[PDB]
Design a protein around this ligand. Structure first.
Ligand SMILES: *[C@@H]1O[C@H](CO[C@@H]2O[C@@H](C)[C@@H](O)[C@@H](O)[C@@H]2O)[C@@H](O[C@@H]2O[C@H](CO)[C@@H](O)[C@H](O)[C@H]2NC(C)=O)[C@H](O)[C@H]1NC(C)=O
Lengths: 274, 9, 98
Protein backbone atom coordinates (compact mmCIF):
# COMPACT_ATOMS: atom_id res chain seq x y z
CA UNK A 1 0.00 0.00 0.00
CA UNK A 2 0.95 3.71 0.25
CA UNK A 3 3.56 5.05 2.61
CA UNK A 4 4.50 8.39 4.06
CA UNK A 5 7.53 10.34 5.36
CA UNK A 6 6.57 13.07 7.82
CA UNK A 7 8.40 15.53 10.03
CA UNK A 8 6.58 17.17 12.98
CA UNK A 9 8.29 20.31 14.29
CA UNK A 10 7.34 22.18 17.47
CA UNK A 11 8.88 25.30 18.97
CA UNK A 12 7.61 26.60 22.33
CA UNK A 13 8.74 29.83 23.98
CA UNK A 14 9.22 29.94 27.78
CA UNK A 15 9.81 33.54 28.77
CA UNK A 16 11.94 33.79 31.91
CA UNK A 17 13.18 30.27 31.44
CA UNK A 18 15.70 30.59 28.64
CA UNK A 19 15.53 29.52 25.02
CA UNK A 20 12.41 27.94 23.48
CA UNK A 21 11.89 24.16 23.60
CA UNK A 22 12.55 22.83 20.08
CA UNK A 23 11.63 19.34 18.91
CA UNK A 24 11.56 17.47 15.65
CA UNK A 25 9.99 14.02 15.35
CA UNK A 26 10.14 12.03 12.11
CA UNK A 27 7.81 9.22 11.07
CA UNK A 28 7.69 6.59 8.33
CA UNK A 29 4.01 5.65 8.20
CA UNK A 30 2.86 5.71 11.85
CA UNK A 31 6.22 4.62 13.24
CA UNK A 32 8.58 7.05 14.94
CA UNK A 33 12.05 6.73 13.34
CA UNK A 34 14.12 9.86 14.26
CA UNK A 35 13.93 12.67 16.83
CA UNK A 36 15.69 15.84 17.99
CA UNK A 37 14.99 17.52 21.30
CA UNK A 38 16.71 20.76 22.38
CA UNK A 39 16.23 19.84 26.05
CA UNK A 40 18.50 16.80 25.84
CA UNK A 41 21.89 16.97 27.55
CA UNK A 42 23.74 16.96 24.17
CA UNK A 43 21.00 17.62 21.60
CA UNK A 44 21.43 15.60 18.45
CA UNK A 45 19.31 13.82 15.89
CA UNK A 46 18.86 10.24 17.07
CA UNK A 47 17.43 7.03 15.64
CA UNK A 48 14.12 5.85 17.08
CA UNK A 49 13.72 2.66 14.98
CA UNK A 50 16.28 -0.18 14.83
CA UNK A 51 16.64 -0.11 11.05
CA UNK A 52 18.09 3.43 11.21
CA UNK A 53 21.34 1.78 12.40
CA UNK A 54 21.91 1.40 8.61
CA UNK A 55 22.80 5.07 8.15
CA UNK A 56 26.38 6.08 8.70
CA UNK A 57 27.70 8.78 10.98
CA UNK A 58 27.57 11.42 8.27
CA UNK A 59 23.75 11.11 8.17
CA UNK A 60 23.42 11.92 11.86
CA UNK A 61 25.92 14.73 11.67
CA UNK A 62 23.98 16.40 8.78
CA UNK A 63 20.57 15.97 10.36
CA UNK A 64 21.94 17.36 13.61
CA UNK A 65 23.41 20.47 11.93
CA UNK A 66 20.11 21.00 10.11
CA UNK A 67 18.11 20.71 13.35
CA UNK A 68 20.38 23.25 15.07
CA UNK A 69 19.87 25.72 12.24
CA UNK A 70 16.12 25.07 12.33
CA UNK A 71 16.05 25.70 16.05
CA UNK A 72 17.49 29.20 15.46
CA UNK A 73 15.09 29.98 12.63
CA UNK A 74 12.12 29.04 14.83
CA UNK A 75 13.51 31.17 17.69
CA UNK A 76 13.46 34.08 15.26
CA UNK A 77 9.95 33.12 14.18
CA UNK A 78 8.63 33.27 17.75
CA UNK A 79 9.92 36.83 18.07
CA UNK A 80 8.57 37.85 14.67
CA UNK A 81 5.09 36.58 15.45
CA UNK A 82 5.01 38.63 18.67
CA UNK A 83 5.36 41.63 16.36
CA UNK A 84 2.83 40.48 13.78
CA UNK A 85 0.23 39.76 16.44
CA UNK A 86 1.16 42.62 18.83
CA UNK A 87 1.64 40.24 21.77
CA UNK A 88 3.73 40.59 24.92
CA UNK A 89 7.06 38.95 25.64
CA UNK A 90 5.75 37.40 28.86
CA UNK A 91 3.50 34.69 27.42
CA UNK A 92 4.34 31.24 26.04
CA UNK A 93 3.49 30.58 22.40
CA UNK A 94 3.76 27.60 20.08
CA UNK A 95 4.71 27.15 16.42
CA UNK A 96 3.98 23.78 14.82
CA UNK A 97 4.87 22.51 11.38
CA UNK A 98 4.09 19.29 9.54
CA UNK A 99 5.96 18.50 6.33
CA UNK A 100 5.74 15.27 4.35
CA UNK A 101 5.37 13.24 1.25
CA UNK A 102 3.37 10.21 0.41
CA UNK A 103 4.02 7.58 -2.24
CA UNK A 104 1.89 4.75 -3.58
CA UNK A 105 2.80 1.10 -3.51
CA UNK A 106 4.96 1.59 -6.63
CA UNK A 107 7.03 4.29 -4.96
CA UNK A 108 5.61 7.17 -7.04
CA UNK A 109 4.62 10.47 -5.37
CA UNK A 110 0.95 10.82 -4.45
CA UNK A 111 1.12 14.08 -2.54
CA UNK A 112 3.31 16.46 -0.62
CA UNK A 113 2.54 19.03 2.03
CA UNK A 114 3.76 21.61 4.51
CA UNK A 115 1.49 23.37 7.00
CA UNK A 116 2.22 25.75 9.88
CA UNK A 117 0.15 26.65 12.98
CA UNK A 118 0.62 29.32 15.62
CA UNK A 119 -0.94 28.71 19.02
CA UNK A 120 -2.85 25.78 17.64
CA UNK A 121 -4.56 27.59 14.74
CA UNK A 122 -3.77 27.38 11.03
CA UNK A 123 -1.19 29.93 9.95
CA UNK A 124 0.05 29.14 6.45
CA UNK A 125 0.02 26.15 4.19
CA UNK A 126 1.45 25.01 0.90
CA UNK A 127 -1.35 24.40 -1.65
CA UNK A 128 -1.84 20.99 -3.28
CA UNK A 129 -0.11 22.26 -6.39
CA UNK A 130 3.17 22.74 -4.50
CA UNK A 131 3.37 26.18 -6.10
CA UNK A 132 1.53 28.68 -3.93
CA UNK A 133 0.68 29.23 -0.32
CA UNK A 134 -2.56 29.91 1.45
CA UNK A 135 -2.65 32.27 4.46
CA UNK A 136 -5.13 32.07 7.34
CA UNK A 137 -4.88 35.74 8.50
CA UNK A 138 -3.11 39.01 7.71
CA UNK A 139 0.07 38.00 9.63
CA UNK A 140 0.45 34.91 7.41
CA UNK A 141 -0.15 37.18 4.43
CA UNK A 142 3.12 38.95 5.33
CA UNK A 143 4.85 35.59 5.36
CA UNK A 144 3.22 34.56 2.04
CA UNK A 145 4.57 37.73 0.40
CA UNK A 146 8.08 37.17 1.81
CA UNK A 147 8.10 33.59 0.64
CA UNK A 148 6.84 34.45 -2.83
CA UNK A 149 9.54 37.10 -3.36
CA UNK A 150 12.22 34.65 -2.20
CA UNK A 151 11.00 31.71 -4.34
CA UNK A 152 10.58 29.40 -1.37
CA UNK A 153 7.83 27.25 -2.89
CA UNK A 154 10.13 26.07 -5.70
CA UNK A 155 12.79 24.92 -3.23
CA UNK A 156 10.20 23.20 -1.04
CA UNK A 157 8.59 21.53 -4.05
CA UNK A 158 12.00 20.12 -5.06
CA UNK A 159 12.41 18.70 -1.54
CA UNK A 160 8.91 17.21 -1.54
CA UNK A 161 9.01 15.62 -5.00
CA UNK A 162 12.66 14.73 -4.86
CA UNK A 163 14.56 14.28 -1.66
CA UNK A 164 11.58 13.34 0.43
CA UNK A 165 10.47 10.64 -2.04
CA UNK A 166 13.98 9.23 -2.56
CA UNK A 167 14.71 8.95 1.14
CA UNK A 168 11.25 7.48 1.88
CA UNK A 169 11.98 4.75 -0.70
CA UNK A 170 15.34 4.15 0.93
CA UNK A 171 13.79 3.81 4.42
CA UNK A 172 11.18 1.37 3.07
CA UNK A 173 14.00 -0.73 1.62
CA UNK A 174 16.28 -0.56 4.65
CA UNK A 175 13.47 -1.06 7.17
CA UNK A 176 11.44 -3.52 5.10
CA UNK A 177 11.28 -6.15 7.85
CA UNK A 178 9.57 -3.61 10.15
CA UNK A 179 7.73 -1.26 7.75
CA UNK A 180 6.40 -3.75 5.22
CA UNK A 181 5.27 -6.41 7.70
CA UNK A 182 1.72 -7.27 8.67
CA UNK A 183 0.78 -8.25 12.23
CA UNK A 184 -2.77 -9.58 12.40
CA UNK A 185 -5.07 -8.30 15.19
CA UNK A 186 -6.06 -10.64 18.02
CA UNK A 187 -9.48 -9.81 19.30
CA UNK A 188 -11.61 -10.31 22.36
CA UNK A 189 -14.77 -9.03 23.97
CA UNK A 190 -15.30 -7.90 27.59
CA UNK A 191 -18.65 -7.52 29.36
CA UNK A 192 -19.69 -4.97 31.99
CA UNK A 193 -22.94 -4.51 33.87
CA UNK A 194 -24.81 -1.22 33.93
CA UNK A 195 -27.99 -0.08 35.70
CA UNK A 196 -31.33 -0.49 33.93
CA UNK A 197 -30.73 -4.06 32.72
CA UNK A 198 -28.20 -2.89 30.08
CA UNK A 199 -24.76 -4.26 29.36
CA UNK A 200 -21.62 -2.77 27.89
CA UNK A 201 -19.87 -4.98 25.32
CA UNK A 202 -16.32 -3.94 24.44
CA UNK A 203 -14.50 -5.31 21.44
CA UNK A 204 -10.74 -5.15 21.69
CA UNK A 205 -8.25 -5.49 18.85
CA UNK A 206 -4.64 -6.01 19.92
CA UNK A 207 -1.17 -6.50 18.54
CA UNK A 208 -1.67 -5.25 15.01
CA UNK A 209 0.46 -3.53 12.35
CA UNK A 210 -0.06 -1.37 10.37
CA UNK A 211 -2.35 0.99 12.26
CA UNK A 212 -5.30 1.16 9.88
CA UNK A 213 -8.16 -0.95 11.12
CA UNK A 214 -11.92 -0.95 11.30
CA UNK A 215 -13.95 -2.22 14.27
CA UNK A 216 -17.71 -2.36 14.06
CA UNK A 217 -20.53 -3.91 16.00
CA UNK A 218 -23.58 -5.44 14.19
CA UNK A 219 -27.10 -6.47 15.08
CA UNK A 220 -29.71 -7.68 12.57
CA UNK A 221 -26.89 -7.60 9.97
CA UNK A 222 -26.57 -3.81 10.35
CA UNK A 223 -23.55 -1.85 11.54
CA UNK A 224 -24.34 0.13 14.69
CA UNK A 225 -21.71 2.84 14.16
CA UNK A 226 -24.15 5.47 15.40
CA UNK A 227 -24.33 4.02 18.91
CA UNK A 228 -20.71 2.93 19.41
CA UNK A 229 -18.10 4.51 21.64
CA UNK A 230 -14.49 4.09 20.73
CA UNK A 231 -10.97 5.23 21.07
CA UNK A 232 -8.65 6.46 18.40
CA UNK A 233 -6.18 3.73 17.38
CA UNK A 234 -3.19 3.92 19.66
CA UNK A 235 0.43 2.74 19.93
CA UNK A 236 1.04 -0.07 22.44
CA UNK A 237 4.72 0.54 23.28
CA UNK A 238 6.39 -2.02 21.01
CA UNK A 239 5.63 -0.73 17.49
CA UNK A 240 2.18 -2.29 17.32
CA UNK A 241 -1.24 -0.76 17.77
CA UNK A 242 -4.50 -1.37 19.62
CA UNK A 243 -8.09 -0.20 19.53
CA UNK A 244 -11.49 -0.81 21.18
CA UNK A 245 -15.12 -0.08 20.33
CA UNK A 246 -18.07 -0.65 22.64
CA UNK A 247 -21.86 -0.75 22.45
CA UNK A 248 -24.55 -0.83 25.10
CA UNK A 249 -27.10 -3.57 24.64
CA UNK A 250 -30.03 -5.04 26.59
CA UNK A 251 -29.15 -7.65 29.17
CA UNK A 252 -29.87 -11.20 28.07
CA UNK A 253 -29.45 -10.23 24.41
CA UNK A 254 -25.64 -10.10 24.15
CA UNK A 255 -25.57 -13.12 21.83
CA UNK A 256 -27.30 -11.12 19.12
CA UNK A 257 -24.39 -8.65 18.74
CA UNK A 258 -21.18 -9.33 16.82
CA UNK A 259 -17.93 -7.46 16.63
CA UNK A 260 -16.22 -7.30 13.27
CA UNK A 261 -12.50 -6.62 12.74
CA UNK A 262 -11.18 -5.63 9.31
CA UNK A 263 -7.39 -5.31 8.75
CA UNK A 264 -4.73 -5.94 6.10
CA UNK A 265 -3.65 -9.03 8.05
CA UNK A 266 -7.19 -10.51 7.95
CA UNK A 267 -8.02 -12.10 4.58
CA UNK A 268 -11.39 -12.69 6.11
CA UNK A 269 -12.47 -10.20 8.78
CA UNK A 270 -12.80 -11.50 12.34
CA UNK A 271 -16.24 -12.02 13.78
CA UNK A 272 -16.66 -12.29 17.58
CA UNK A 273 -19.33 -12.21 20.18
CA UNK A 274 -19.48 -12.15 23.99
CA UNK B 1 15.86 13.05 5.46
CA UNK B 2 14.51 16.19 7.12
CA UNK B 3 13.73 19.47 5.46
CA UNK B 4 16.52 21.92 5.98
CA UNK B 5 16.23 25.69 5.89
CA UNK B 6 12.65 26.47 7.07
CA UNK B 7 12.50 30.06 5.76
CA UNK B 8 11.70 32.63 8.39
CA UNK B 9 8.12 33.74 8.79
CA UNK C 1 -6.78 25.26 25.29
CA UNK C 2 -7.68 21.63 25.10
CA UNK C 3 -7.76 19.23 28.05
CA UNK C 4 -5.88 15.96 27.63
CA UNK C 5 -7.53 12.63 27.18
CA UNK C 6 -5.64 10.12 29.30
CA UNK C 7 -5.67 6.43 28.41
CA UNK C 8 -3.97 3.65 30.42
CA UNK C 9 -3.65 0.19 28.97
CA UNK C 10 -1.39 -2.84 28.69
CA UNK C 11 0.08 -4.30 25.47
CA UNK C 12 -1.18 -7.83 26.32
CA UNK C 13 -4.17 -8.92 28.40
CA UNK C 14 -2.75 -8.91 31.90
CA UNK C 15 -1.60 -12.23 33.35
CA UNK C 16 -0.03 -12.19 36.83
CA UNK C 17 3.66 -13.10 36.58
CA UNK C 18 3.96 -12.53 32.80
CA UNK C 19 6.01 -9.57 31.46
CA UNK C 20 4.00 -6.91 29.68
CA UNK C 21 4.09 -3.23 28.79
CA UNK C 22 2.06 -0.53 30.42
CA UNK C 23 1.05 2.49 28.39
CA UNK C 24 -0.26 5.98 29.17
CA UNK C 25 -1.40 7.70 26.02
CA UNK C 26 -2.06 11.38 26.55
CA UNK C 27 -3.89 13.06 23.72
CA UNK C 28 -5.88 15.96 22.21
CA UNK C 29 -4.13 18.59 24.34
CA UNK C 30 -2.92 22.14 23.91
CA UNK C 31 -0.78 23.93 24.88
CA UNK C 32 2.12 21.40 24.67
CA UNK C 33 3.58 21.94 28.13
CA UNK C 34 2.66 18.91 30.19
CA UNK C 35 3.89 16.59 32.92
CA UNK C 36 3.23 12.89 32.73
CA UNK C 37 4.22 10.39 35.39
CA UNK C 38 3.48 6.70 35.62
CA UNK C 39 3.05 5.37 39.16
CA UNK C 40 3.24 1.92 40.72
CA UNK C 41 1.66 1.66 44.20
CA UNK C 42 1.79 5.45 44.40
CA UNK C 43 5.46 5.70 43.61
CA UNK C 44 6.98 7.16 40.43
CA UNK C 45 8.25 4.50 38.05
CA UNK C 46 11.84 5.40 36.97
CA UNK C 47 13.00 5.28 33.35
CA UNK C 48 9.61 5.47 31.66
CA UNK C 49 10.02 5.94 27.93
CA UNK C 50 8.36 8.85 26.18
CA UNK C 51 7.59 8.27 22.53
CA UNK C 52 5.24 8.76 19.63
CA UNK C 53 4.97 12.53 20.01
CA UNK C 54 2.83 13.90 17.21
CA UNK C 55 -0.04 16.27 16.53
CA UNK C 56 -3.37 15.79 14.79
CA UNK C 57 -5.06 17.72 11.98
CA UNK C 58 -6.53 20.14 14.57
CA UNK C 59 -2.99 20.65 15.96
CA UNK C 60 -3.62 19.00 19.29
CA UNK C 61 -0.75 17.06 20.81
CA UNK C 62 -0.39 13.32 21.33
CA UNK C 63 2.32 11.48 23.29
CA UNK C 64 2.97 8.02 24.74
CA UNK C 65 4.59 7.09 28.01
CA UNK C 66 5.38 3.43 28.37
CA UNK C 67 7.23 0.97 30.59
CA UNK C 68 7.88 -2.72 30.89
CA UNK C 69 6.06 -4.35 33.80
CA UNK C 70 5.04 -7.67 35.18
CA UNK C 71 1.60 -7.37 36.79
CA UNK C 72 0.85 -9.08 40.10
CA UNK C 73 -2.43 -9.57 41.86
CA UNK C 74 -1.60 -6.79 44.33
CA UNK C 75 0.18 -3.96 42.44
CA UNK C 76 -1.84 -0.98 41.26
CA UNK C 77 -0.74 1.40 38.50
CA UNK C 78 -1.77 4.86 37.36
CA UNK C 79 -0.78 7.77 35.19
CA UNK C 80 -0.74 11.24 36.64
CA UNK C 81 -0.87 14.27 34.35
CA UNK C 82 -0.47 17.97 35.03
CA UNK C 83 -1.64 20.42 32.42
CA UNK C 84 -2.82 24.07 32.48
CA UNK C 85 -6.34 23.11 31.40
CA UNK C 86 -6.85 21.35 34.71
CA UNK C 87 -6.91 22.89 38.16
CA UNK C 88 -5.61 19.74 39.85
CA UNK C 89 -3.31 17.01 38.55
CA UNK C 90 -5.36 14.18 37.09
CA UNK C 91 -4.62 10.62 38.22
CA UNK C 92 -5.95 7.84 35.93
CA UNK C 93 -5.74 4.29 37.17
CA UNK C 94 -5.07 1.27 35.05
CA UNK C 95 -8.31 -0.76 34.86
CA UNK C 96 -7.18 -4.32 34.19
CA UNK C 97 -10.79 -5.50 33.61
CA UNK C 98 -11.76 -2.93 30.96
C1 LIG D 1 13.74 -7.35 3.53
O1 LIG D 1 14.62 -7.15 2.42
C2 LIG D 1 15.75 -8.03 2.42
C3 LIG D 1 16.75 -7.74 1.29
O2 LIG D 1 17.35 -6.47 1.13
C4 LIG D 1 18.11 -5.96 2.23
O3 LIG D 1 17.92 -6.12 3.65
C5 LIG D 1 17.47 -4.99 4.42
C6 LIG D 1 17.67 -5.29 5.91
C7 LIG D 1 18.17 -3.67 4.08
O4 LIG D 1 19.43 -3.65 4.69
C8 LIG D 1 18.24 -3.48 2.56
O5 LIG D 1 18.87 -2.25 2.22
C9 LIG D 1 18.91 -4.69 1.92
O6 LIG D 1 18.94 -4.54 0.52
C10 LIG D 1 15.29 -9.50 2.27
O7 LIG D 1 16.38 -10.39 2.50
C11 LIG D 1 16.71 -11.24 1.35
O8 LIG D 1 15.75 -11.89 0.52
C12 LIG D 1 16.04 -13.23 0.09
C13 LIG D 1 14.98 -14.24 0.53
O9 LIG D 1 15.09 -14.52 1.92
C14 LIG D 1 17.42 -13.78 0.47
O10 LIG D 1 17.74 -14.82 -0.43
C15 LIG D 1 18.53 -12.75 0.38
O11 LIG D 1 19.79 -13.33 0.70
C16 LIG D 1 18.23 -11.62 1.35
N1 LIG D 1 19.18 -10.53 1.12
C17 LIG D 1 19.97 -10.14 2.13
C18 LIG D 1 21.03 -9.11 1.83
O12 LIG D 1 19.84 -10.57 3.28
C19 LIG D 1 14.27 -9.84 3.34
O13 LIG D 1 13.61 -11.03 2.98
C20 LIG D 1 13.20 -8.77 3.55
N2 LIG D 1 12.60 -9.04 4.84
C21 LIG D 1 11.31 -9.33 4.93
C22 LIG D 1 10.84 -9.99 6.21
O14 LIG D 1 10.55 -9.05 4.00
Amino acid sequence: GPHSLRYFVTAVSRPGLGEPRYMEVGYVDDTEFVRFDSDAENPRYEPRARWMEQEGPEYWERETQKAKGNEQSFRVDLRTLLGYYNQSKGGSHTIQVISGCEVGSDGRLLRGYQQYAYDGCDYIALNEDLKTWTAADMAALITKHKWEQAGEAERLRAYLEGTCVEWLRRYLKNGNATLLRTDSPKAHVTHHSRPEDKVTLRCWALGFYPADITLTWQLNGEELIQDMELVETRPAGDGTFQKWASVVVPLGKEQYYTCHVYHQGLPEPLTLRW
Amino acid sequence: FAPGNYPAL
Amino acid sequence: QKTPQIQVYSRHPPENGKPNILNCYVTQFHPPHIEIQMLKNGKKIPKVEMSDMSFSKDWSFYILAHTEFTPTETDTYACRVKHDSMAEPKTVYWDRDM
